[PDB]
Amino acid sequence: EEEELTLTILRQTGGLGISIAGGKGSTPYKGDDEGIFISRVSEEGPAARAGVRVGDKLLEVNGVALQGAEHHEAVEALRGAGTAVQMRVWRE
């Protein structure tokens, strides 16, 4: 079971309702992948309603790939991604 999903998180203000872990140069979410992963989804928050799932690997934010991104770079991308944030994710 491997799939790629395009999820659109909608917000008026505030956060997306997720936590991300990992990134280049940080402790990985899993030993075999240094990338950005969803470590927590807020109960029935924006991301939850958009269909995000813990363990999802975040490939892109509004068309900008996070391959090779440091943890802070992914954080900045999600914070400044706007009110409609489309995420290409990898789910197993």
């Binding site: 956060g15 997720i18 936590s19 991300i20 940080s26 402790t27 927590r40 943890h71 954080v75 914070r79």
Partner: peptide, 5 residues
């Protein structure tokens, strides 16, 4: 580590 966004 995690960052809430």
């Amino acid at each position: 580590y995690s960052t809430a966004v």
